[PDB]
Protein backbone atom coordinates (compact mmCIF):
# COMPACT_ATOMS: atom_id res chain seq x y z
CA UNK A 1 0.00 0.00 0.00
CA UNK A 2 2.27 2.76 -1.27
CA UNK A 3 1.15 6.33 -0.93
CA UNK A 4 -1.27 7.87 -3.43
CA UNK A 5 -0.99 11.65 -3.79
CA UNK A 6 -3.38 14.10 -5.47
CA UNK A 7 -2.92 17.79 -6.29
CA UNK A 8 -5.54 20.44 -7.05
CA UNK A 9 -4.88 24.06 -7.98
CA UNK A 10 -7.15 27.05 -7.38
CA UNK A 11 -6.99 30.78 -8.02
CA UNK A 12 -9.14 32.77 -5.65
CA UNK A 13 -9.67 36.24 -4.29
CA UNK A 14 -8.47 36.93 -0.75
CA UNK A 15 -11.92 36.62 0.83
CA UNK A 16 -12.55 33.30 -0.94
CA UNK A 17 -9.54 31.28 0.26
CA UNK A 18 -11.09 29.98 3.48
CA UNK A 19 -14.30 28.72 1.90
CA UNK A 20 -12.47 27.10 -1.01
CA UNK A 21 -10.18 25.13 1.33
CA UNK A 22 -13.17 24.32 3.54
CA UNK A 23 -14.99 23.14 0.43
CA UNK A 24 -12.14 20.83 -0.50
CA UNK A 25 -11.15 19.30 2.86
CA UNK A 26 -14.74 18.55 3.89
CA UNK A 27 -15.58 16.76 0.65
CA UNK A 28 -12.45 14.58 0.98
CA UNK A 29 -13.15 13.97 4.68
CA UNK A 30 -16.83 13.16 3.94
CA UNK A 31 -15.44 10.31 1.81
CA UNK A 32 -12.67 9.54 4.32
CA UNK A 33 -14.68 9.07 7.51
CA UNK A 34 -17.24 6.67 8.93
CA UNK A 35 -19.72 6.17 11.76
CA UNK A 36 -18.34 5.79 15.29
CA UNK A 37 -17.23 2.20 15.99
CA UNK A 38 -18.63 0.73 19.21
CA UNK A 39 -16.87 -2.51 20.14
CA UNK A 40 -18.12 -5.16 22.53
CA UNK A 41 -15.73 -7.45 24.36
CA UNK A 42 -16.74 -10.49 22.28
CA UNK A 43 -15.19 -8.84 19.20
CA UNK A 44 -18.55 -7.64 17.82
CA UNK A 45 -18.93 -3.98 16.92
CA UNK A 46 -21.58 -1.61 15.64
CA UNK A 47 -21.22 1.46 13.41
CA UNK A 48 -22.96 4.74 14.12
CA UNK A 49 -24.53 6.97 11.52
CA UNK A 50 -23.10 10.01 9.75
CA UNK A 51 -25.20 13.09 9.17
CA UNK A 52 -24.45 15.62 6.45
CA UNK A 53 -25.25 19.24 5.84
CA UNK A 54 -25.21 21.77 3.06
CA UNK A 55 -23.01 24.87 3.50
CA UNK A 56 -23.62 27.90 1.30
CA UNK A 57 -20.48 29.90 0.57
CA UNK A 58 -20.72 33.63 1.22
CA UNK A 59 -17.92 34.75 -1.15
CA UNK A 60 -18.30 32.00 -3.76
CA UNK A 61 -21.44 31.04 -5.68
CA UNK A 62 -21.11 27.54 -4.32
CA UNK A 63 -22.53 24.95 -1.94
CA UNK A 64 -20.72 21.97 -0.48
CA UNK A 65 -21.61 19.09 1.84
CA UNK A 66 -19.85 18.26 5.08
CA UNK A 67 -20.32 15.61 7.72
CA UNK A 68 -22.43 17.13 10.50
CA UNK A 69 -19.62 17.07 13.12
CA UNK A 70 -19.10 20.49 14.65
CA UNK A 71 -15.83 19.67 16.41
CA UNK A 72 -14.44 18.60 13.03
CA UNK A 73 -15.66 21.78 11.34
CA UNK A 74 -14.14 23.80 14.19
CA UNK A 75 -10.88 21.85 13.80
CA UNK A 76 -10.53 22.54 10.06
CA UNK A 77 -11.81 26.11 10.33
CA UNK A 78 -9.01 27.03 12.74
CA UNK A 79 -6.15 25.59 10.70
CA UNK A 80 -7.68 26.93 7.46
CA UNK A 81 -7.47 30.29 9.22
CA UNK A 82 -3.85 29.60 10.19
CA UNK A 83 -3.19 29.07 6.48
CA UNK A 84 -4.90 32.27 5.37
CA UNK A 85 -3.25 34.71 7.78
CA UNK A 86 0.06 33.03 6.90
CA UNK A 87 -0.71 33.90 3.29
CA UNK A 88 -1.54 37.45 4.34
CA UNK A 89 1.78 37.98 6.13
CA UNK A 90 3.51 36.49 3.07
CA UNK A 91 3.00 39.87 1.41
CA UNK A 92 4.05 39.51 -2.19
CA UNK A 93 4.47 35.82 -3.08
CA UNK A 94 0.69 35.30 -3.08
CA UNK A 95 1.02 31.51 -3.06
CA UNK A 96 0.72 28.75 -0.51
CA UNK A 97 -0.44 25.19 -0.36
CA UNK A 98 -2.30 23.00 2.09
CA UNK A 99 -2.02 19.27 2.44
CA UNK A 100 -4.18 16.60 4.01
CA UNK A 101 -2.73 13.16 4.48
CA UNK A 102 -4.22 9.95 5.82
CA UNK A 103 -1.90 7.52 7.57
CA UNK A 104 -1.91 4.46 9.74
CA UNK A 105 0.11 4.10 12.94
CA UNK A 106 2.51 1.18 13.26
CA UNK A 107 3.70 0.28 16.76
CA UNK A 108 7.40 1.01 17.26
CA UNK A 109 10.01 -0.41 19.61
CA UNK A 110 11.34 1.78 22.39
CA UNK A 111 12.34 4.60 22.28
CA UNK A 112 10.98 5.44 18.79
CA UNK A 113 7.49 6.88 18.39
CA UNK A 114 5.00 4.90 16.32
CA UNK A 115 5.77 5.41 12.68
CA UNK A 116 3.01 7.08 10.70
CA UNK A 117 2.65 5.56 7.22
CA UNK A 118 0.56 7.66 4.76
CA UNK A 119 -1.59 5.78 2.29
CA UNK A 120 -3.07 8.91 0.61
CA UNK A 121 -2.17 12.63 0.46
CA UNK A 122 -4.24 15.55 -0.83
CA UNK A 123 -2.53 18.84 -1.77
CA UNK A 124 -4.24 22.13 -2.64
CA UNK A 125 -2.09 24.88 -4.20
CA UNK A 126 -3.72 28.33 -3.86
CA UNK A 127 -2.90 31.51 -5.84
CA UNK A 128 -4.53 34.48 -4.12
CA UNK A 129 -5.23 37.46 -6.36
CA UNK A 130 -6.72 40.75 -5.14
CA UNK A 131 -9.37 42.43 -7.28
CA UNK A 132 -10.07 46.13 -7.75
CA UNK A 133 -13.66 46.80 -8.79
CA UNK A 134 -16.54 45.48 -6.71
CA UNK A 135 -18.12 44.04 -9.87
CA UNK A 136 -15.14 41.85 -10.59
CA UNK A 137 -15.43 40.91 -6.93
CA UNK A 138 -19.07 40.05 -7.63
CA UNK A 139 -18.37 38.41 -11.02
CA UNK A 140 -15.53 36.43 -9.39
CA UNK A 141 -18.05 34.81 -7.03
CA UNK A 142 -19.40 32.96 -10.09
CA UNK A 143 -16.37 31.35 -11.75
CA UNK A 144 -14.61 30.34 -8.57
CA UNK A 145 -17.84 28.49 -7.82
CA UNK A 146 -17.85 27.01 -11.31
CA UNK A 147 -14.22 25.90 -10.81
CA UNK A 148 -14.80 24.34 -7.39
CA UNK A 149 -17.60 22.37 -9.06
CA UNK A 150 -15.07 20.63 -11.29
CA UNK A 151 -12.63 20.29 -8.39
CA UNK A 152 -15.37 18.48 -6.44
CA UNK A 153 -16.16 16.34 -9.51
CA UNK A 154 -12.44 15.41 -9.80
CA UNK A 155 -12.09 14.53 -6.11
CA UNK A 156 -15.09 12.19 -6.52
CA UNK A 157 -13.65 10.60 -9.67
CA UNK A 158 -10.30 10.02 -7.93
CA UNK A 159 -12.02 8.31 -4.99
CA UNK A 160 -13.67 5.72 -7.25
CA UNK A 161 -10.32 5.42 -9.05
CA UNK A 162 -8.57 4.70 -5.71
CA UNK A 163 -8.62 1.04 -4.73
CA UNK A 164 -6.63 0.70 -1.50
CA UNK A 165 -8.19 1.45 1.87
CA UNK A 166 -6.90 0.34 5.30
CA UNK A 167 -7.98 -3.06 6.54
CA UNK A 168 -10.81 -2.49 8.98
CA UNK A 169 -9.31 -2.81 12.45
CA UNK A 170 -10.02 -4.73 15.65
CA UNK A 171 -10.56 -2.95 18.98
CA UNK A 172 -6.85 -3.02 19.83
CA UNK A 173 -5.83 -1.64 16.41
CA UNK A 174 -8.63 0.92 15.78
CA UNK A 175 -6.60 3.84 17.10
CA UNK A 176 -3.92 3.01 14.49
CA UNK A 177 -6.40 3.52 11.62
CA UNK A 178 -9.08 5.93 12.85
CA UNK A 179 -9.17 9.17 14.77
CA UNK A 180 -11.43 8.04 17.62
CA UNK A 181 -11.36 11.46 19.27
CA UNK A 182 -14.62 12.90 17.92
CA UNK A 183 -18.11 12.19 19.16
CA UNK A 184 -20.15 12.48 15.94
CA UNK A 185 -17.88 10.89 13.35
CA UNK A 186 -14.83 8.64 12.91
CA UNK A 187 -12.38 10.15 10.41
CA UNK A 188 -9.40 8.20 9.22
CA UNK A 189 -6.23 9.25 11.03
CA UNK A 190 -5.13 12.36 9.27
CA UNK A 191 -2.76 15.29 9.35
CA UNK A 192 -3.21 18.60 7.63
CA UNK A 193 -0.29 21.02 7.22
CA UNK A 194 0.55 23.94 4.95
CA UNK A 195 3.38 26.03 3.45
CA UNK A 196 3.74 29.53 2.07
CA UNK A 197 5.53 29.11 -1.24
CA UNK A 198 7.75 31.48 -3.17
CA UNK A 199 6.78 32.15 -6.78
CA UNK A 200 8.93 31.42 -9.79
CA UNK A 201 8.37 30.75 -13.45
CA UNK A 202 6.13 28.21 -15.12
CA UNK A 203 8.76 26.43 -17.05
CA UNK A 204 7.53 26.07 -20.67
CA UNK A 205 5.40 23.15 -19.66
CA UNK A 206 3.00 25.55 -21.37
CA UNK A 207 3.89 23.97 -24.71
CA UNK A 208 3.06 20.50 -23.38
CA UNK A 209 -0.24 21.87 -22.04
CA UNK A 210 -0.67 23.70 -25.38
CA UNK A 211 -0.28 20.37 -27.20
CA UNK A 212 -3.13 18.87 -25.16
CA UNK A 213 -5.44 21.71 -26.23
CA UNK A 214 -4.53 21.07 -29.89
Partner 1 sequence: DLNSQDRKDLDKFIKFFALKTVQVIVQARLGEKICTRSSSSPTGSDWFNLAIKDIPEVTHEAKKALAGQLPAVGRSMCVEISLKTSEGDSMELEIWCLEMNEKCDKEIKVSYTVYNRLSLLLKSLLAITRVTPAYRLSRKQEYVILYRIYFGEVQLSGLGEGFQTVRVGTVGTPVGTITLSCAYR
Binding site for partner 1 (CB under 8 A): 27, 30-31, 34-36, 38, 46-54, 56, 61-65, 67-69, 148-149, 152-153, 155-157, 159-160, 183-185
207: left (phi over 0), alpha (psi -120 to 50) or beta: alpha
Q: Spell out the residues 6+ positions from residue 162 whose beta carbon is closer than 8 angstroms to its own.
A: 4, 120
What's the min distance (Å) between Cβ of 135 and partner 1? 20
Cβ closer to partner 1: 17 or 152? 152
Cβ closer to partner 1: 70 or 173? 70
What's the min distance (Å) between Cβ of 28 and partner 1? 10
Closest C-alpha to 18, from 121, 128, 100, 135: 128
Q: Measured at the alpha carbon of residue 155, what is the angle toward residues 150 and 156, in degrees to the nearest 5?
A: 95
Cβ closer to partner 1: 36 or 90? 36
Cβ closer to partner 1: 69 or 104? 69
Tell me how far apart the alpha carbons of residues 158 and 163 are, in angstroms, rounded to a whole number: 10
What's the min distance (Å) between Cβ of 63 and partner 1? 5
Closest C-alpha to 65, from 35, 73, 37, 94: 73
What's the min distance (Å) between Cβ of 180 and partner 1? 11
Contact assessment for residue 62 and residue 19, using Cβ atoms and an 8 Å cutoff? yes
What's the min distance (Å) between Cβ of 9 and partner 1? 17
DSSP state of 64: E
Cβ closer to partner 1: 32 or 84? 32
Amino acid sequence: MNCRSEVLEVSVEGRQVEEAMLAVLHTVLLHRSTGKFHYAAAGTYSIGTVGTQDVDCDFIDFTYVRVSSEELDRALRKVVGEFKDALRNSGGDGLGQMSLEFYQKKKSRWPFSDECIPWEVWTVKVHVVALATEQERQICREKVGEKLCEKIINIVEVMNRHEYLPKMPTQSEVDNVFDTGLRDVQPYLYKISFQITDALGTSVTTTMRRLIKD
